[PDB]
Every structure is written in structure tokens, then in C-alpha cells.
Amino acid sequence: LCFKLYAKGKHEKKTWFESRDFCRALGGDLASINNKEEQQTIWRLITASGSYHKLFWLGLTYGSPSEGFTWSDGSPVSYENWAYGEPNNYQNVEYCGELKGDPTMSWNDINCEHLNNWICQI
Ligand SMILES: C[C@@H]1O[C@@H](O[C@H]2[C@H](O[C@H]3[C@H](O)[C@@H](O)[C@H](O)O[C@@H]3CO)O[C@H](CO)[C@H](O)[C@@H]2O)[C@@H](O)[C@H](O)[C@@H]1O
Ligand SMILES: [Ca+2]
């Protein structure tokens, strides 16, 4: 699968659901990061575009209380790269996952209605 970053204009950020719909409209989905190689591919996409210091929706979304986080594309949640302290379900309203697009490439749970950049896979 090919990844593509979407860091558009200031008023062009999207909720998690809007981002998922955008990627699905192109025949793909929000990006799942299944291992370190895929993480590196995305990090180099960030360096290549110069789209530094941005946050991006990934395909992380909460399932049932039993299962916790899942990937929107159905991939297993094998690899995890949560930032320290995450996921923390801050104020009980955080059911989607974002990537901090810095060298650590760490993940944070955040409210799904937050407006973010996003990363698709096709
Ligand atoms: C939502 C939060 O995101 C990260 O923490 C950031 C922090 O979130 C604030 C948020 O701006 C505010 O609306 C809420 O009421 O309190 C949160 C906790 O301080 O904001 C600071 C900037 O002030 C940084 O951007 C933090 O990264 C994440 O670390 C948390 O787990 C949580 O998902
Ligand atoms: Ca959080």
C-alpha cells in the first residue's frame, strides 16, 4: 500500500470520520502503521514534503470496551507506538488516534471530532 500525506490549508483540516471518507473515496483508507518500516516510509514522506511539526489522523479508532483500539482497514494492532502516557482517554472523549509527525512518530488518542491533517493509504 502507498501512503500519502494530506497537510492542506489551515481551514482544510478534517475530523477523523471526514478523513476516513476522503481516503475511502479514493479507493483506500486511513493509514495503518503495522511495523517500523511503514513508520519510516511515512516519516520520510514528512521529510520529503517539508510538512514538519504537524499532527495527522491515522486509522486508529476505538472498538468495543473489550478490544480497545483497532485499525479502520481491519489490520491487526500488532505494532504500537503510543507516546508515553497514551492512550489516556483524556476526559473520556478520546476514541481516535493521531500521529505526531516528528522523528518519534508517536501516537496519541484524541477526540474524533478534532480537526487534523491526515494520511491515506491506497
Ligand atoms: C487532547 C490532549 O492532547 C495532548 O495534550 C495536549 C494538550 O491538550 C490540552 C487541550 O489543548 C485542552 O483543550 C484540554 O482541555 O486539555 C488538554 C490537556 O492539557 O494541549 C497542549 C497545549 O496546551 C499540547 O498540545 C498537548 O500535546 C495529549 O498529550 C493528551 O493525551 C490529550 O489527548
Ligand atoms: Ca490522549
For residue 5, report the phi and psi dihedrals to the nearest 5 degrees. Answer: -85, 145
Q: What whole-number distance in Å separates Cα of residue 4 and Cα of residue 33?
A: 13
Question: Quick one: DSSP state of residue 12?
Answer: G
Domain interval for residue 45: 1-122
Q: What whole-number distance in Å separates Cα of residue 96 and Cα of residue 60?
A: 5
Data resolution in angstroms = 1.4
Ligand with smallest separation from the Cα of 62:
2
38-76 exposure pattern, b = at least 16 Cβ within 10 A, e = fewer: bbeebbebbeeeeeeebbbbbbbbbeeeeeebbbbbebe
Tell me the CA–centroid distance for residue 105 and ligand 2, in Å.
Answer: 15
Among 55, 69, 90, name the best residue to mutate to test ligand 1's pocket (greatest count of ligand atoms within 8 A of Cβ): 90
Residues 6+ apart with CB under 8 A from 5: 42, 45, 46, 49, 51, 56, 117, 119
Q: 116 in ligand 1 pocket by Cβ < 6 Å?
A: no
- Total domains in the chain come to 1
